[PDB]
Amino acid sequence: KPIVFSGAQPSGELTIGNYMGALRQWVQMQDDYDCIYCIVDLHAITARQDPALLRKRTLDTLALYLACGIDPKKSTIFVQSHVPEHSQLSWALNCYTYFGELSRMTQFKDKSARYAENINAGLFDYPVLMAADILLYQTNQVPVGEDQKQHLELSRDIASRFNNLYGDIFKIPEPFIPKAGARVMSLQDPTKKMSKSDDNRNNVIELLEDPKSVVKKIKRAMTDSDEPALIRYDVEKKAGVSNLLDILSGVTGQSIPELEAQFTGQMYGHLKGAVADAVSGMLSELQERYRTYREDEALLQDVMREGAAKARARAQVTLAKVYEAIGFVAQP
Template sequence: MSDFAPRVFSGVQPTGNLHLGNYLGAIRKFVALQESQDCIYCVVDLHSITAQLVHEDLKSQIRSITAAFLAAGIDPKRHIVFNQSRVSGHAELAWIFNCVARIGWMNRMTQFKEKAGKDRENASLGLLAYPSLMAADILLYRATHVPVGDDQKQHLELTRDIAIKFNNDFSERIAEAGLGTEIAVGEETVNGYFPITEPLIGGEATRVMSLKDGAKKMSKSDPSDLSRINLTDDAEQIARKIKKAKTDPDALPSEPKGLEGRPEADNLVGIFAALAEKTKADVLSEFGGRQFSEFKPVLADLAVEKLSPINGEMRRLIDDPGHIDAVLKDGGERAGAIAEKTMRDVKDIVGFLR
């Protein structure tokens, strides 16, 4: 892709309890990536105020997300774990990117349309502009790869568009300052400062759906707690939620094509496949022709087996906020050192007087 040193960046918002979808779609991938990549994992607390300005206890939510990172197996000594608001470069670079991005780009963002709904005029400016902040989060560390779910692919495309436009608009200054790196953009090679970040998408159940409605994504904001499996749920709660999960009256098919038009069945098979680290085809070869009354108890046992250790460690860590705060402080200092270098370069490229 380029001469940039490979680096992974990703973040999770501190809003409500983390659930199975967050774990399978993001956190478990974070753990796997740290074995082969230089990783920066962030609790994106600035993002958390875009849709809801006032939170009951934002500090405890930040600590809870951090606890989930650590309980799942992320090593904060080998890699960086911090909360976004500790590093001022995120907000500084986001403002510059607000001036790089075009309003038309922002208006096309699907998530803004969904979250703002029909009352778009009353949505916060932060909600409209937060993809620009997301681009700043990634490019502040000149990250080359981001693990994303299907619903975040559009935002990563915007990050790439911003990087390309910045590199093009300031190409001469980047070259004059000796800050450029050869970057492949399509079939062309250009000299730029920011990488064209690549998505990392893969595995089963990259998008986990609600247990009550297979057409809706599993969400922390869903009013029904039965719609999701929280990472803090105990074994009894996990088993009860899977038992009550919506299904259809037909038996499981013998191959994935038979899941078409059956969103709830597809969701539960996808969850089983992801937890067992198998394909949907593998799962259906074992359970095809069997009823959900047989499948659900096996799925519940598997979910309890995989999630209970994380649940217990999360509870232990949450009871030790001093340890979590120390991890975030150390991570913030290390992230800040990288960010400071980027912001010095960017200010020189833009032409600010330092």
């Protein structure tokens, strides 16, 4: 099966757009692909973190991924810092990465401007660690955010350069583009996607958000002033109403035409009530599952320990090959 590597920032925060758009689809693909989910705590610390929050959020992310349906027997899920081979490969790959490839990175320049008080070497060097993360597992495909395209291209270039020097040691990874999930946009500006760091909290619904707040947000979602009220799909002219239909469709699996038939003669209030009920229901169930996992420390420890063992057993094969190629005396 193709090997898919996804890195998750330790946050606990996932928008519904993220879930229904992507993660929820990936959860259904665990039999057809060899999926590896890595909670990237080593990357988080390129910005200063509160130590208690970092630990807490690591566990929050794990419990959330488990609640969403990532199955630790079918997939490999682990915390990055629990697998030494990441940091080991990252150092080695530094030596096959050009300083210029790192200095020209858009993200480095952008984050340098925003974190001007903490331009540390980790902020500069983290694309190398990202490359290590991916290349360690003989990864075929990586789901890439728009802002991560340049980082994926560096991974491919490093892998290619290393293979040209030493033989086929790494796989050249490709973008993971699975079939479209649900379309979900911001509730007060439906021309833009949801973003977890939006200053307008009424735009965004997160998976662990109090259902009562989620319902309020949906009930005040932007709709048009058409007279009479017409529940019909048209992104250009009726973006707000269209987005409510797309969100409901994403929850129930009903088609846009089916929903338009179902809502013939109805008010925008009725459409919003329907969306609020469907989303609240889905989120309340997910949150009960999250709580069951999140409160079970022994289960979380077992999953992390087992995940890290699974990951290390794959990673060590690749690192041994890298170290062999470079010329190091193998550990006895």
